[PDB]
Design a binder for these strands. Structure first.
Ligand SMILES: Nc1ncnc2c1ncn2[C@@H]1O[C@H](COP(=O)(O)OP(=O)(O)O)[C@@H](O)[C@H]1O
Ligand SMILES: Nc1ncnc2c1ncn2[C@@H]1O[C@H](COP(=O)(O)OP(=O)(O)O)[C@@H](O)[C@H]1O
Ligand code: BEF
Ligand code: BEF
Lengths: 98, 85, 92, 99, 452, 102, 89, 93, 84, 452
DNA sequence: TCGGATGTATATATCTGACACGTGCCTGGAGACTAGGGAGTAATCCCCTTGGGCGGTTAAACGCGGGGGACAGCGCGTACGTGCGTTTAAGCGGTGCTAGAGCTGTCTACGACCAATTGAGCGGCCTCGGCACCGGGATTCT
DNA sequence: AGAATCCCGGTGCCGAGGCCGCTCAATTGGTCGTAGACAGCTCTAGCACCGCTTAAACGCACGTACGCGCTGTCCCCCGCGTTTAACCGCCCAAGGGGATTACTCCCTAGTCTCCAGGCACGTGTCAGATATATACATCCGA
């Protein structure tokens, strides 16, 4: 058996996913999610197929932006691991809900 | 007894996909409690944007959320998006 | 020469707290708040009429300006009260 | 005019303001009425909270501090006035992990 | 077999003029035999060449079996699966060198479509034969695009129902089977009936169930309505009006505020008319199947099935059951399995080799698994069940020709016992609307038959 | 019938800009130099972004600009990254950034 | 759309580079966004002073307010050069 | 008194008041020097300099109280210039 | 030899003022390197606002910065100021 | 002293009719030596009741000194300073009980204004006496508001220049010294000259320098212009055009891009005409004071001062120097101290008791500190310098009466040697503009004197 | 420090499906007159920002203990990364069915424009008490 | 101990509330184009269920290295007291500057008349994609 040391296959993933431009969530569960969410405000709705695409591509650019600064909170605290504390700090000094 | 039993659509955002998003964000290690925190902070974002989009739709007397309703809802909350009209 | 909302806010305050008064700095704060909200709702109504192709600002898009500008439980009351007035304005 | 509607705000002045600022070409008849009602509602909900904060301090006249405290306690108003600084208005008292 | 000898006389003829043909032989008449007969007629007269057969998954098996029983030695091979198909590709025979060992290439519509590249390389195919022509009845289907990449010097189409929906399916096929009379201009047929029979006499070859053999006993297709019970009426109104998601939401054990399924009320009314449990079990999101196990009797159509079946066990002749969805067949199975009946079932969810052996067991006369659940598109095409004798179509719609192909499944050369058909339905309901639509579609079908 | 653009020496449509300024009634009247000025500014900004994008495409040894190159050019430069601070170019992606062991 | 004109400008700076169908959509969106930012800033500038005309001084102040420093410094010169050539020539 | 006890006296004293914490004349002098590099020979209204101080002090107080969340997140009580930089990095400045 | 030697105006913001601001922020201990960091972020913030408030004044042909230019300059940056 | 005996005859009279008066006695005589005489006239028998005296800091000292030398025993006390004033408040004497030990209350305009509360409590003051009436020439000055809180049953005003600027200062004083003359209606004076002399004969009491006794030989006020040198012309043009902040910025050792001091030129071109170093010292930090020490000769007005002074050392009679600012006096001191002359200086920056002893030393005839720098408002009011003999006004403006009060400083009862005055100035320059303005102000002053 | 497992990095091809003209009109340009007034460029009175001073009096600056908080190091053990063998399930083809978006045609009601009123509000008169504002003593405190 | 603090009597004074004479705003009544809502026809997408592939998700086992706690050292920040100098300051003064109103012009409205653009649709020509192949470069463990 030939194993890699912990954290070397993670760094080639960072390089892999920071060169591509693809859309990283499965398309059907995301649509079911947005339909479930919209099922409250109005019932029996229809979604133009290019609107769920706009939603998905607006929602991942938000999570990618939140992760790259919950990772500044972890390095400020002398770590390399992210916990929910970092997300809450980042969201609270952004005012996302404060 | 048999039947199907469905799963919370929010559970359809799987752990591998969240790890992929974190990798594109630059993260090296993930704690095991991140996933239920991310699942909850995605729902809030979607609720805000969809609540504005449906208001734009119902003003037009339409029954189909279209792609400007979303782009207008996004531009209103500080999030300008290029590439959809 | 300079027009403001002093009379109307004072009358509303006497309607809410019959005995409390208000100083001048707080009166200016309240005047500015009303101007800010008016500008917000009006500009959103104009822009939202412009998204559709209509040259008229009716009441039903003061509705949706309110639903976009005010948050949650605040709007659900305001909207209601608005409808109230309009009914009492027309079936009078 | 704006006595037939049960409002305390001036519908005529609101309409003058709406037509002066040239937000559109034509202004309907229910628009100043609607906009004048939803302004007195917000004024009435800020003033009640400010008066309540006045009553606790054993005061009979509202001051800027009372508006500040009333806005920063309630969740909806603090969300609406999230970036406003009330002149001469202090801060909401708070201390973190220590005596 | 005389007809089948006129069936091989006409495909040897087609081979001559260099023409292409639509074998629309009557379904249930032995079209497949004839095919391997033509394929032996050529197999040994210097007609060695790349030969390719494409068919539905269910039939591929039956075909191999038939080869193993009618023809003494036809080098043949079933190219089914992926990655495991790569080895047999070469342990098949030389790459392009065609010898007396070059084995007949049998593939499926998926395989053919997904990896045409592999077979694209092969020489001009002597004869590509497509078992179910109805698959190509759309002129924009991706299979058709991928099927043109193949270099084919001859084409052939097997079917039993050439036209089902309208004339445009006839138009798309023609262009394919025969690019010569394509006429990509809406066609000129639209007196004219005779003019169409001039173009179509040359290729189309159809027979009939009556043919000559008195061997074929006749069948009886009869509609036996049922009366919608009270509870179904309550469910139907709460939908015609509204607040069903809430009146039933009164329980709503799961998925609180279950999404108003107020779409195509018609459908959400057909599902009711099938069995109310379908609409109940989602709103409530409960886990336990019918609690009393008898509420199933609340469905009127269920109760008419039960009594029919008790009277048809009085004789024991094996039955056949068809449905449109698979949730409903599942309810049925639950119900009967509680009483204790042994059932066999082949829907689309079940695997291929798994379903092939089930038949081989159902076909075992000694075994007493008389009941046989079977969904329409699931396995209503390509399966011999001479063992069974009666077909019950719980529900079928939108295309009448879909149903016929099933009835014949039971009624096919070798079925000695006379066949009945029981198209159940509910009187004065959404079902009758569909029934009338189907009659309309048939009306068109009979104007087509007069054409014949 | 010389167009306004040729008189102004531009490549953008001065007349179509003037119509767009009228429609929407941003105000009542519109001067004669306003659309010329606005069109000149729009052309300037366009040429700025397109030049940076073309450089980024040559750097990746290509000859056709795609969204990735616009993303690279915008988020490398200072003033453009300030201006397009909170915009999402679609089908682009973030630039490489690894910090510390992470 | 502005696509025609956008293409022209490209053939001035890179005579040998082309553009993908999606990149032209991006450029169209960018031009439409900037135009509306500038035209609304000019509207506010005119309303704060009670003037009913948007001349080429409102556009200059809108550019100074909206574009970042070094970018605005060059946009102003381009625009004033255009207006000078328009009136004089 | 012991180190750290009259500090909390100051947190309590200054969060009740409303008055200005920077001296007026030096602040006025500063805002005048950092406008000499935009426009020479400029004068200010007296209410224009009172409005700049109200906004600047509010800005600095608002920045200090999330600079303090970063220090606590790192398990400290002392604010360091590293905390201000983290706070401004995420707010976007 | 005995003349007026001036100081950078930047210093008039004294260490006690910065400590008062931090105390109103909730801070308990302050490092000694905070003062020159605060004194540098303040200047950046202040010269972002004065640059727009003077542009709003040059447009109107005035020579006096009024309290309304400053309010508009602050509103341009996402922060609203009530009460003037 | 006869005049001073008519000075005490008229304030005993004022005491009688119950009237209030403006002792506008000529400056440089009597006044002080007249006030304490009236104060002994009443301290005898009439006592002091609560008696309060307010005056400029410089005079308070001279007054105590005079008391210690003219009156044998007048309980008196100087209430100067803060916090240390609280102890002497009670170690003064009983709180309100006025006895033969109740000490005369001497305060300053700051003390009086800042803590009137303390003295507000005291009884109706028998006589409040304000040394320099000019302090109250504005009717909105905060001192006046705080001065009314005192319960005063009598008022008195000492001055030597009642009106300086215009008639409204006469208006504000009247209302104060005598509220019987409220006349808060712009006054009715505006032939009329005689009508004004009817109102003012009753209170105002003015005498002259000539009076009767020869005493002080006539003084001579003479204007000796100077020719602006080349360098100053260069500075003036770069100021009048522009780019001075930059041409001089060519050096700008400190404060890079030094703020354009283009404040109407008036605030600067005078500074040039005083000495160009003032401008150079700011644009460029120049920590070092003109090191050449002959670059001071570039100033034409400086060179005319130097030669004047060398010719006035030929006799050694002590000089007096006045200026408007304190930077310029500083340059002068630097210059002379380099040569070695011993100088004494009292501006507003120096402390009170410190400046009092400096005089006590300058007044020492044996000591050879002949030079005496002195800024106008600094110490141009209340100081005896009989030791000196010549006054040089480097620069003074905007109010001519400001200068006169200084000249008299040297020229006052006891000055035996005849006095000169050298108002230096630069010909054809901004200075002449101011000179003419001053002449205009005097013109008004002489129309006022004709009134007298 | 070598030798090996792979991982990316260069080079062969095909293969789309997109990029690249071409055309043909229709709606928007530009051009020419006329009208009204909206700026533009004056002339005047003022309230108002801009220097000196000058005191002065808390606050700032400086210095000195001395402890308590930051930071480094060390040990333990627990939770997350790597790789492998199933299991869904998304992700594709095919099959249907109205539903709801878009445009046009037609009339009735509704909002801009304009005359003649008149009572709302705004700027400026007074007047009194709820803010403060001071000492002066009982109570916590660490 | 020696240090911290609220409440309760004593203090003014000037800003909030009333009054006001008013004049220009907002109301009532009229007229009238042109927007509304409706109505109807067309027919282009949302969607809705079922059947196959294969790629991705999921579970699992090990092992290790990173988080977290404990201890020690030292340095720098805090609290206190003295002395200096600065902001909140009283006064001085000129020119400034800022919102006022003036005939005057020319510069934007429009109403129209046609040449000109552009946008849509119909075709090819790829070029950057992708897959197979080949070195050339790097983690890894001993
Ligand atoms: N010529 C024949 N010889 C022998 N058996 C036959 C012949 N034709 C039909 N059969 C029997 O009838 C069955 C049905 O015919 P088949 O070829 O399967 O029909 P289909 O045309 O539907 O494929 C066959 O499987 C076989 O058992
Ligand atoms: N009556 C007098 N008796 C003695 N010496 C006098 C008398 N009058 C004036 N002097 C002398 O002349 C000086 C100047 O008079 P003073 O009273 O100081 O003038 P001022 O009126 O300016 O205060 C006195 O200090 C004193 O030396
Ligand atoms: F092969 Be047959 F059509 F069942
Ligand atoms: F006291 Be005098 F006026 F010098």
């Amino acid at each position: 058996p030939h194993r890699f040391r912990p954290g070397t296959v993670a760094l080639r993933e960072i390089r892999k996913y920071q060169k591509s431009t693809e859309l990283l969530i499965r398309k059907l569960p995301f649509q079911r999610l947005v339909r479930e969410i919209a099922q409250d405000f109005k019932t029996d709705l229809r979604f133009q197929s290019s609107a769920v695409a706009a939603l998905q591509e607006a929602a991942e650019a938000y999570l990618v932006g939140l992760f790259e600064d919950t990772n500044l909170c972890a390095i400020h605290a002398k770590r390399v691991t992210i916990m929910p504390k970092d997300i809450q700090l980042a969201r609270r000094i952004r005012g996302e809900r404060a | 007894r048999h039947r199907k039993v469905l799963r919370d659509n929010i559970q359809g955002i799987t752990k591998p996909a969240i790890r992929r998003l974190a990798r594109r964000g630059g993260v090296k290690r993930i704690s095991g409690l991140i996933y239920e925190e991310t699942r909850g902070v995605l729902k809030i974002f979607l609720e805000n944007v969809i609540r504005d989009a449906v208001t734009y739709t119902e003003h037009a007397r339409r029954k189909t959320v279209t792609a400007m309703d979303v782009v207008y809802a996004l531009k209103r909350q500080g999030r300008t998006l290029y590439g959809f009209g | 020469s300079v027009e403001t909302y002093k009379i109307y806010i004072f009358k509303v305050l006497k309607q809410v707290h019959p005995d409390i008064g208000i100083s001048s700095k707080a009166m200016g704060i309240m005047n500015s708040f009303i101007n800010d909200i008016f500008e917000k709702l009006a500009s959103e109504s104009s822009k939202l009429a412009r998204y559709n192709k209509k040259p008229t600002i009716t009441s039903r898009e003061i509705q949706t300006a309110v639903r976009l500008v005010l948050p949650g439980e605040l709007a659900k009351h305001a909207v209601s009260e608005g409808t109230k007035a309009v009914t009492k304005f027309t079936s009078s | 005019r704006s006595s037939k509607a049960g409002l305390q705000f001036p519908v005529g002045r609101i309409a003058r303001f709406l037509k002066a600022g040239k937000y559109a070409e034509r202004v309907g008849a229910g628009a100043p009425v609607y906009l004048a009602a939803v302004l007195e509602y917000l004024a009435a909900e800020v003033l009640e909270l400010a008066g309540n904060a006045a009553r606790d301090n054993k005061k009979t006249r509202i001051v800027p501090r009372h508006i500040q405290l009333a806005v920063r306690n309630d969740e909806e108003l603090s969300k609406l006035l999230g970036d406003v600084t009330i002149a001469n208005g202090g801060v909401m008292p708070n201390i973190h992990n220590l005596l | 077999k005389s007809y089948q000898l006129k069936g091989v006389k006409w495909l040897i003829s087609l081979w001559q003029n260099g023409l292409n043909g639509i074998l629309a032989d009557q379904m249930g008449l032995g079209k497949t035999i004839q095919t391997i007969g033509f394929l032996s007629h050529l197999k040994g007269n210097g007609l060695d060449g790349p030969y390719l057969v494409i068919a539905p998954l269910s039939t591929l098996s039956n075909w191999f079996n038939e080869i193993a029983r009618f023809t003494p030695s036809i080098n043949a091979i079933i190219y089914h699966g992926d990655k495991n198909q790569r080895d047999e590709l070469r342990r098949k025979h030389m790459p392009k060198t065609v010898g007396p060992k070059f084995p007949i290439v049998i593939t499926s519509y998926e395989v053919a479509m997904n990896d045409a590249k592999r077979i694209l390389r092969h020489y001009p195919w002597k004869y590509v034969v497509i078992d179910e022509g109805h698959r190509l009845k759309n002129h924009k289907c991706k299979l058709l695009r991928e099927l043109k990449h193949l270099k084919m010097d001859n084409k052939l189409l097997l079917t039993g129902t050439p036209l089902q929906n309208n004339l445009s399916e006839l138009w798309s096929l023609l262009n394919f089977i025969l690019p010569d009379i394509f006429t990509s201009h809406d066609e000129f047929e639209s007196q004219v009936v005779s003019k169409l029979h001039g173009i179509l006499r040359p290729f189309i070859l159809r027979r009939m169930k009556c043919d000559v053999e008195l061997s074929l006993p006749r069948k009886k297709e009869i509609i036996m309505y049922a009366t919608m019970t009270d509870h179904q009426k309550k469910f139907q109104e709460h939908l015609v009006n509204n607040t069903l998601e809430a009146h039933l939401g009164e329980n709503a054990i799961r998925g609180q505020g279950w999404k108003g399924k107020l779409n195509n009320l018609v459908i959400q009314l057909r599902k009711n008319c099938n069995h109310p449990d379908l609409l109940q079990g989602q709103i409530d999101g409960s886990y336990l199947y019918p609690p009393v196990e008898e509420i199933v009797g609340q469905c009127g159509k269920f109760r008419l099935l039960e009594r029919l079946l008790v009277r048809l066990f009085a004789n024991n002749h094996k039955v056949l059951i068809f449905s449109q969805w698979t949730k409903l067949l599942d309810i049925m199975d639950y119900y009967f399995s509680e009483k204790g009946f042994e059932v066999c079932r082949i829907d689309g969810s079940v695997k291929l080799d798994e379903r092939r052996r089930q038949i081989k067991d159902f076909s075992d006369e000694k075994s007493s698994c008389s009941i046989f659940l079977l969904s329409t598109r699931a396995g209503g095409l390509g399966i011999n069940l001479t063992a069974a004798d009666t077909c019950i179509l719980y529900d079928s719609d939108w295309n009448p020709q879909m149903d016929l192909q099933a009835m014949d499944r039971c009624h096919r050369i070798g079925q000695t016992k006379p066949v009945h058909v029981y198209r159940l339905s509910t009187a004065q309901s959404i079902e009758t609307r569909v029934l009338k639509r189907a009659y309309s579609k048939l009306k068109l079908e009979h104007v087509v038959i007069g054409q014949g």
